[PDB]
Amino acid sequence: YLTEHPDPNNENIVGYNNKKCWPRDARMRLMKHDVNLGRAVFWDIKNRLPRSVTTVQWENSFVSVYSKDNPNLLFNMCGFECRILPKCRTSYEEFTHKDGVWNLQNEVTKERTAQCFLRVDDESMQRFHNRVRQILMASGSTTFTKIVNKWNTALIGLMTYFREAVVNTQELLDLLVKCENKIQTRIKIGLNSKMPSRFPPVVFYTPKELGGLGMLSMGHVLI
Amino acid sequence: KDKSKELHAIKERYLRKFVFEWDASEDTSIDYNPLYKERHQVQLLGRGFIAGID
Amino acid sequence: MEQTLPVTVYEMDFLADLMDNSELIRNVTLCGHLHHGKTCFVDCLIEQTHPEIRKRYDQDLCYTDILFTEQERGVGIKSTPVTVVLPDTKGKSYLFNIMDTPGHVNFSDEVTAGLRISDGVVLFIDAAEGVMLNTERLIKHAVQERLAVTVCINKIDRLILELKLPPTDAYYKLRHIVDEVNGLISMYSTDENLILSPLLGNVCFSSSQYSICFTLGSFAKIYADTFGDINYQEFAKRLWGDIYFNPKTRKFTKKAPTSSSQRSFVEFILEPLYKILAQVVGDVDTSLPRTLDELGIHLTKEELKLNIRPLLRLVCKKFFGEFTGFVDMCVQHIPSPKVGAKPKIEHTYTGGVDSDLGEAMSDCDPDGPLMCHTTKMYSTDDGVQFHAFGRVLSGTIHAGQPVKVLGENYTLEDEEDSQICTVGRLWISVARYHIEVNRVPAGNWVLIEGVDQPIVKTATITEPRGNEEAQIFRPLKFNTTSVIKIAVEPVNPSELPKMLDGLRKVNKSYPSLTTKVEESGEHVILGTGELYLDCVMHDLRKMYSEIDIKVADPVVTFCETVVETSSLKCFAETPNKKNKITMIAEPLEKGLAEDIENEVVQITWNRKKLGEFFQTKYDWDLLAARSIWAFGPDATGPNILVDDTLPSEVDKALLGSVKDSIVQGFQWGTREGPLCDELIRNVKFKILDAVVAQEPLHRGGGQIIPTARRVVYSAFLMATPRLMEPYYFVEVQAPADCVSAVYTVLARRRGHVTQDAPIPGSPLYTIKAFIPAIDSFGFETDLRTHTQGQAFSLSVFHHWQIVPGDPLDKSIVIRPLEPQPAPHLAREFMIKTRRRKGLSEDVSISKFFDDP
Amino acid sequence: TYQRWQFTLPMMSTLYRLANQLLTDLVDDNYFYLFDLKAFFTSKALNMAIPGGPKFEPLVRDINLQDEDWNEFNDINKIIIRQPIRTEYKIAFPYLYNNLPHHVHLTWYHTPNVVFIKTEDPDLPAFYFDPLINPISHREPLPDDDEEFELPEFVEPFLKDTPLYTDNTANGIALLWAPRPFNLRSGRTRRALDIPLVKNWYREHCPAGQPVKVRV
Amino acid sequence: RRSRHCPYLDTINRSVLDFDFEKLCSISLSHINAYACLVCGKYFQGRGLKSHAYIHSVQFSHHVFLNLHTLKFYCLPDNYEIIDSSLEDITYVLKPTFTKQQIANLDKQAKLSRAYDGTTYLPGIVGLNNIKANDYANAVLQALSNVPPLRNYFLEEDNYKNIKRPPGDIMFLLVQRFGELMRKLWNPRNFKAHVSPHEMLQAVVLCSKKTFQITKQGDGVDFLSWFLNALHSALGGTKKKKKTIVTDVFQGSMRIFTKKLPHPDLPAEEKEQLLHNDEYQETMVESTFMYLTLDLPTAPLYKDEKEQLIIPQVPLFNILAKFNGITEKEYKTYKENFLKRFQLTKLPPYLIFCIKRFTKNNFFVEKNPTIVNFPITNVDLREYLSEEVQAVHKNTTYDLIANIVHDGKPSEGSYRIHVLHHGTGKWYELQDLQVTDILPQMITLSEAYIQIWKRR
Numbered sequence A: 001y002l003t004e005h006p007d008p009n010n011e012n013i014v015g016y017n018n019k020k021c022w023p024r025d026a027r028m029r030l031m032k033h034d035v036n037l038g039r040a041v042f043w044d045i046k047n048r049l050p051r052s053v054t055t056v057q058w059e060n061s062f063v064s065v066y067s068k069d070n071p072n073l074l075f076n077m078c079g080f081e082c083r084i085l086p087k088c089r090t091s092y093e094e095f096t097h098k099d100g101v102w103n104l105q106n107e108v109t110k111e112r113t114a115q116c117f118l119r120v121d122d123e124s125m126q127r128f129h130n131r132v133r134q135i136l137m138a139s140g141s142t143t144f145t146k147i148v149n150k151w152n153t154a155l156i157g158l159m160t161y162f163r164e165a166v167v168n169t170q171e172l173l174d175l176l177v178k179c180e181n182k183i184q185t186r187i188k189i190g191l192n193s194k195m196p197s198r199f200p201p202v203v204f205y206t207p208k209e210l211g212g213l214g215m216l217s218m219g220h221v222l223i
Numbered sequence B: 001k002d003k004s005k006e007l008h009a010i011k012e013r014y015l016r017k018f019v020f021e022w023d024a025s026e027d028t029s030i031d032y033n034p035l036y037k038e039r040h041q042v043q044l045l046g047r048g049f050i051a052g053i054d
Numbered sequence C: 001m002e003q004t005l006p007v008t009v010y011e012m013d014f015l016a017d018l019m020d021n022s023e024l025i026r027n028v029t030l031c032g033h034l035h036h037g038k039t040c041f042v043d044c045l046i047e048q049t050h051p052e053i054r055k056r057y058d059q060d061l062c063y064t065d066i067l068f069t070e071q072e073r074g075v076g077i078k079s080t081p082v083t084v085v086l087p088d089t090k091g092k093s094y095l096f097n098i099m100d101t102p103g104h105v106n107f108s109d110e111v112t113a114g115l116r117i118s119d120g121v122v123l124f125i126d127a128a129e130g131v132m133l134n135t136e137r138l139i140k141h142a143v144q145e146r147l148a149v150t151v152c153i154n155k156i157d158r159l160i161l162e163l164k165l166p167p168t169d170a171y172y173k174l175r176h177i178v179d180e181v182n183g184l185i186s187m188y189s190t191d192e193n194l195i196l197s198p199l200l201g202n203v204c205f206s207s208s209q210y211s212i213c214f215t216l217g218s219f220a221k222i223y224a225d226t227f228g229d230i231n232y233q234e235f236a237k238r239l240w241g242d243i244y245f246n247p248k249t250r251k252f253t254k255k256a257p258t259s260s261s262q263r264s265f266v267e268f269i270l271e272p273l274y275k276i277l278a279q280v281v282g283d284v285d286t287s288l289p290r291t292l293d294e295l296g297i298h299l300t301k302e303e304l305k306l307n308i309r310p311l312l313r314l315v316c317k318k319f320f321g322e323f324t325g326f327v328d329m330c331v332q333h334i335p336s337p338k339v340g341a342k343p344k345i346e347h348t349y350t351g352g353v354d355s356d357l358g359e360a361m362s363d364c365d366p367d368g369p370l371m372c373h374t375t376k377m378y379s380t381d382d383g384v385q386f387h388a389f390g391r392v393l394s395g396t397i398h399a400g401q402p403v404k405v406l407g408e409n410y411t412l413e414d415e416e417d418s419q420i421c422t423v424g425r426l427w428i429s430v431a432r433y434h435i436e437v438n439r440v441p442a443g444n445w446v447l448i449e450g451v452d453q454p455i456v457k458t459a460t461i462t463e464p465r466g467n468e469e470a471q472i473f474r475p476l477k478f479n480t481t482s483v484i485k486i487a488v489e490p491v492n493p494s495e496l497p498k499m500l501d502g503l504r505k506v507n508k509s510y511p512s513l514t515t516k517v518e519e520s521g522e523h524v525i526l527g528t529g530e531l532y533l534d535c536v537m538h539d540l541r542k543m544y545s546e547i548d549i550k551v552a553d554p555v556v557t558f559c560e561t562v563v564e565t566s567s568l569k570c571f572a573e574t575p576n577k578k579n580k581i582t583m584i585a586e587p588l589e590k591g592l593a594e595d596i597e598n599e600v601v602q603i604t605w606n607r608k609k610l611g612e613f614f615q616t617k618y619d620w621d622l623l624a625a626r627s628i629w630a631f632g633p634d635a636t637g638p639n640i641l642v643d644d645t646l647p648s649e650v651d652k653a654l655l656g657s658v659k660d661s662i663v664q665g666f667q668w669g670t671r672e673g674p675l676c677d678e679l680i681r682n683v684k685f686k687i688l689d690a691v692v693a694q695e696p697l698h699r700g701g702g703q704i705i706p707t708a709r710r711v712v713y714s715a716f717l718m719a720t721p722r723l724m725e726p727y728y729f730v731e732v733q734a735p736a737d738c739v740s741a742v743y744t745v746l747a748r749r750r751g752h753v754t755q756d757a758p759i760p761g762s763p764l765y766t767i768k769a770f771i772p773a774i775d776s777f778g779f780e781t782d783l784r785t786h787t788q789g790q791a792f793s794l795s796v797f798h799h800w801q802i803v804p805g806d807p808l809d810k811s812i813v814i815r816p817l818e819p820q821p822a823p824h825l826a827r828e829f830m831i832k833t834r835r836r837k838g839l840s841e842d843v844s845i846s847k848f849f850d851d852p
Numbered sequence D: 001t002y003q004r005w006q007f008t009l010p011m012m013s014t015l016y017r018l019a020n021q022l023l024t025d026l027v028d029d030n031y032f033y034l035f036d037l038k039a040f041f042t043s044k045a046l047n048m049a050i051p052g053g054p055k056f057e058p059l060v061r062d063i064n065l066q067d068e069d070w071n072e073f074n075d076i077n078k079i080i081i082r083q084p085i086r087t088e089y090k091i092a093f094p095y096l097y098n099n100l101p102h103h104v105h106l107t108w109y110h111t112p113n114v115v116f117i118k119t120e121d122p123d124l125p126a127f128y129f130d131p132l133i134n135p136i137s138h139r140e141p142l143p144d145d146d147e148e149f150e151l152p153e154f155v156e157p158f159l160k161d162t163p164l165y166t167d168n169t170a171n172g173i174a175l176l177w178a179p180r181p182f183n184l185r186s187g188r189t190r191r192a193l194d195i196p197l198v199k200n201w202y203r204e205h206c207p208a209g210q211p212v213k214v215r216v
Numbered sequence E: 001r002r003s004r005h006c007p008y009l010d011t012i013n014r015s016v017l018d019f020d021f022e023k024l025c026s027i028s029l030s031h032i033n034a035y036a037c038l039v040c041g042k043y044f045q046g047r048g049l050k051s052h053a054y055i056h057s058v059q060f061s062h063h064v065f066l067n068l069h070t071l072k073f074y075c076l077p078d079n080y081e082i083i084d085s086s087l088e089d090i091t092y093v094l095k096p097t098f099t100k101q102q103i104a105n106l107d108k109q110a111k112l113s114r115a116y117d118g119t120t121y122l123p124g125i126v127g128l129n130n131i132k133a134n135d136y137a138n139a140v141l142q143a144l145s146n147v148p149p150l151r152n153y154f155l156e157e158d159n160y161k162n163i164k165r166p167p168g169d170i171m172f173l174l175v176q177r178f179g180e181l182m183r184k185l186w187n188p189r190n191f192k193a194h195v196s197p198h199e200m201l202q203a204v205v206l207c208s209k210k211t212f213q214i215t216k217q218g219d220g221v222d223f224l225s226w227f228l229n230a231l232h233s234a235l236g237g238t239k240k241k242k243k244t245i246v247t248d249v250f251q252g253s254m255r256i257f258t259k260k261l262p263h264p265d266l267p268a269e270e271k272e273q274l275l276h277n278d279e280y281q282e283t284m285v286e287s288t289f290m291y292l293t294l295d296l297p298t299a300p301l302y303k304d305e306k307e308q309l310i311i312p313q314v315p316l317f318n319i320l321a322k323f324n325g326i327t328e329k330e331y332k333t334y335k336e337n338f339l340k341r342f343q344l345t346k347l348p349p350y351l352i353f354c355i356k357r358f359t360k361n362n363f364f365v366e367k368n369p370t371i372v373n374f375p376i377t378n379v380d381l382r383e384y385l386s387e388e389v390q391a392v393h394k395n396t397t398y399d400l401i402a403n404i405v406h407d408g409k410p411s412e413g414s415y416r417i418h419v420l421h422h423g424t425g426k427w428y429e430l431q432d433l434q435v436t437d438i439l440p441q442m443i444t445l446s447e448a449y450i451q452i453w454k455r456r
């Protein structure tokens, strides 16, 4: 790779994509050898496919390296963000049961050998937030029941797709409560033009068949 | 507590209403080094004095 | 020439005439402690010879300290040359090449560079502070560099306007300062012919701020000018030093009449000076007109309207006139340098004085071979091209004349560190402006353009097609060791070449700077201290390379040693499986490393004298004493290499054949070191056995050298290894009250207070202590900010000491960002410096052993 | 017009004594180490606060230390920590401890300590060995007495008659070190608005043991 | 004496040797006495005991180095020159040299060269590496190559080596590194079919003062103009020598007929009266031009039945109608309008057209997508000259030899270049590191941005 693309200034680190969602010690650490290996692998793969038929672009790709310097193996698949950490490498610690962590264990000897930590992709977070924004904007002259039905459908979809990742993600919970509060504020504004104080939650959270809106909750509401 | 605060400093370094009174939260000079807490006020040979004070 | 120049009392034509006559030249270096008046003295001299230039009333002009950083910080950072034509008390004129040096203990490399081309030293001592750290170190350095030293006691007005001591006590203070200087000189120089005393003319008294400068001779000349019937020479011979005047008989006696008479000095020099200063600053409106009438000084009403400080400067200037005492001192007690050439060649020239060129240069004639020597490199404001500043020891430099520049690595056998260049222009550098000339004779300082490319630090310029048997002058021997270390990187890697160019330029500029690239591609810079490195970074970031640079946190450079002989005798074999070597290691005796470093011994010595010294001093049997082979990484290193192999087991001729290869391997191994790849200090390596292959193509070359290094590493590792730390020697100058605060601050940082004493005649105290260099960072600012500025400290590298812990211990566990306790500092430092260098995670004592 | 003035030294001394209660009796600027306009400019530029100093909005958009992505340079596993690098070290040595020092000012280095022995008793001689001074613990090519050198009758010290000190010598020496404008003997006339009385008071370190409101 | 019998000579591996970068010691950064280790291709300070090269030799067992300035080999640690004629290839690749016969026969070469690896290529048609953003500079440099006169002048170092330069001249780096790059490009015995312009571009950024960086792409035409002027000035030795190689090859002369229009918002009487003022009459300000700046008509703003493709087109001669004595361009400076006519007076042997593709409208820059319809092998410019100069000029037919094309949006721009390879007649399309063969009839179907034509 370097014979094809000589690099005298060690400039192979300027444009390297990294998963900013994780902490610094959980991201990929840019060593000379690992950065060069990633760039070389990408170059080798991109050589195979002709430019005419289809192209593989570095800006939209991500290549992660696990080696003697980097102990984490990161990737993003199907809207998830998975990070695999071996037990032998840089664990040195006992583990309890957290919700978002899968205990990858060897299949023949049945031994815990690695842990996979999961998160919800920032792209999926943004898509959900934009869905809520669309619901609110297009709300316009629509009905409270329809607004609540849209909210319930969106929340059910997100929560049934990203099951453990939502719990593992500390930003998605805040986003969920923010959007829920926005929806409730929309209902209250429709009710009256002046904001009340300590509005009761029964109207929102009572089932539809019993006269309520049947809202679905994902926060910590104290009656 | 001072040692924990020092380690915290190291880790942090490396890894409408009309208010006429400034808030105490604006205060600086809250240090952990005793050399900067008690700073050995100057003795001008015992013959110079600070202005204003009696 | 013909370029434009400022108006001068003398003329450039007369200056050009003077340069030819090498009997009326004087190469002087102004040196001394920080903030002791050197720059203002030089500026007052410039004011004298250049009427247009002046020093502002409220602000002090310098005319040195030209740099922007110097102007902002207030501390001289770079030495500055000046060339003036000063008049002597007798009315004769001489040419003075004055190199004004900085004072801060961090910039002693500039002082050494000035000394190399100077012939005399003028030591500036403050009248209040007295002798200080840098004055002591500079006296040592000068007497070791074999220069003639004279003293100027500056700031004598602090005894009158700040301490307001009585005249007798002021005299006692001055006498005490002289005594301290004499004691230091006698300590550091065996010869006793060099004694400083105002009676002889080696000491002058100056107050640079108020333009006062005089010697006993000059003040007696003032007395004679007022009354024309006295020999000022005899008067000066009698003034100083316990000579009481008797007016009834008008004679001087060693016995005091009336038991209350003041000494002749206190009566004639000091007391009237007290009177003049007191009258100017206390009674400017009542009796000053009468006092000026008595003195004969007449000054205009607009002039006497001034404020007290400018008025004092003006009155003192009118009363005293020119700085003739300084010129008298320098002329009488500094070589010509036609006279002083011989010691200069003897000490510096590598080819020896006895050489034919040695004699030709000791003659020091303008008509002869060209043997210029360049030690400084000054950059233009644009920062593109450097001009080489040096001295001409023979011949005559001509503009446009091709020359041959020889660098430091040049030797008469390897004639590749030379290059043929073409000198562009010549300058006679006055501080702030350069008088361009077309030729320069032997015995003068010169700026040269067009010879900067093939030289980095120091070089010698000769003529091609002549002086085939030419050898370089010795490279500068520095007064200290650069220890503090930083790493550098560009912010945007696309701009690396700019950073590399800036690194090269700063390496050229700073004489003792060392820039290098580590195995892991890390650009490291070695500097003396915090302010040194700050100035270096400012220059690298603003002047030379115009990019933005990330700097790592400062760290120091360690060494590696052993504390007991090797557990087992170790060995290695060449890849040919012949040529086996077998060594042992042990620690040297106390002080032997210091002797080797300070040149008490020289491997160049005849084996007779070498063995004699080693036997008589360090209780070495003559058999071993005559078995020395090498002296560590350099010809003068703190490690020794001996061979104990008896001739009965091996062939001495064969060992002599492979001696050079073994010595090269030993020196390389000592330079690198196994623990963390750093110098090995204070170790004795004894070759206990050696089986050598018979054929030269079976031995030598790439066979023995790596094997010798591997054996050295194995022996060192087998011997109980330890790391060695550098220790700074701190000297704080604090009020009598803040001593306890200084104690607290030092105790916080592993410091140890050796002493704390008062300054006689002053209300201040000096506290001397030792501080680990690694912990020294930020210490001075800590002290100053805790004391509210009343305490100031200067620190300089002193010696190496063993780090508390044991390095080769794997039980210890180091957290990433925690200050480790004392017992495993060694292990922490070892592993982290290994990581920095980029070597393996750790080292095993069997790593370099051949068996595993 | 009341434009310019030129006073006598006794007048200046009396005025200085009267104004004494408004002046801090400082002889040097060492007091203001890392507490002067240049240090404050540097702190503002680097977006840091001297313990007792002001605090502004970031001059340039601050660089987040959680953004950098663990290169070889900033590898925390090679650092050796002995003492935390306080803001004061960076303010004192801006170019050695900071990355990207922009619009940073170099701070004046040490100025030699002024050792002036203020006189408390006006009855003493002007030139006097005050007890504050550390004592000089006492202990030569001299020509013989039998020598014949003889001075002429006319010759004697330059100002034998003039007294060494007068009743207004210590006053002048003190005025030499009095703060502006009491070290002058002439000048121009300012405006009552243009004369601030407590600028020197609030430029100093705050006295110890004061309430938070006055500190702020 | 052991020379010619070095036992280690096999260990050399030409696969790693890369002589395209700065010659400085890898451990001291000094330029003096630089030796390249032929086993691993790293630079060190040279020779002698205790030097970096010697220490590296004993430490790694790399026992063969080459002095980068004297082109002599040496074996270490035991120093002695190596005299073997099979190593001449390394020296030639390190510092190519072209003799007069080689330069003369340079063009008439129809047989491919083969790099050290099994890669065939042709001299001159050689890719230029693309550091982050280099496409525009690579295109301009490639077009300046393939110009026989300028290339023939810069292939011989002694041509410009001895021309004087002031003390602090940093503009001569441009000329000397351009010569180095030209020699590297036209080297027929290389080790790789591509070369790196890193050094030349570093010099370019240094001289341009951070204009035309390598991490941001600028205007190809702006770079071309600045580079031509920089080379002209630099070759001008301690003066403006009226005739440098650049002026001899590219610079032509035109006669510019400015007629200041009286005023737009004036009455007819005043407008026709102002004609007699002679301030609004034709003048002649004959000057010199390095490159004509042809201007495209704006997009039609509406599609049409014929040439069903939405893409508009123009004839090259319609574009060239300006610069005849008849047509009039309408210059509009603030407060004033000029009717400018032009008349070519001296046509250079190598004529450069720069089509003003990009244009800044009220809100952003726009790339006019018009395609000029030009022939390749013939264009007769006789008719655009005065009869006073047609007699002087014998040859006026021009052939397209180089064409630089810009593709993509004004932001995500990219550059390619179609170059005619003499010796053969084939047209090669070069992108940064990709060389393809392109049919002559497909050249005109792209958005021409710069053209270099040869007078024959």
Ligand SMILES: Nc1nc2c(ncn2[C@@H]2O[C@H](COP(=O)(O)OP(=O)(O)OP(=O)(O)O)[C@@H](O)[C@H]2O)c(=O)[nH]1
Pocket (backbone or CB within 6 Å): C033, C034, C035, C036, C037, C038, C039, C040, C041, C060, C062, C074, C075, C076, C077, C101, C102, C103, C104, C154, C155, C156, C157, C158, C206, C207, C208, C209, C210, D111, D112
């Ligand atoms: N009282 C008094 N102060 C002086 C006198 N001469 C110089 N100074 C002060 O001493 C300080 C040092 O000034 P310089 O002489 O320029 O400093 P330097 O001698 O070049 O020493 P470096 O800064 O290390 O180069 C300045 O603040 C001066 O005002 C003097 O004769 N009397």
Ligand SMILES: [Mg+2]
Pocket (backbone or CB within 6 Å): C038, C039, C064, C065, C075, C076, C100, C101, C102, C103
């Ligand atoms: Mg100075």
Ligand SMILES: [Zn+2]
Pocket (backbone or CB within 6 Å): E037, E038, E039, E040, E041, E042, E056, E060, E062
């Ligand atoms: Zn190698």
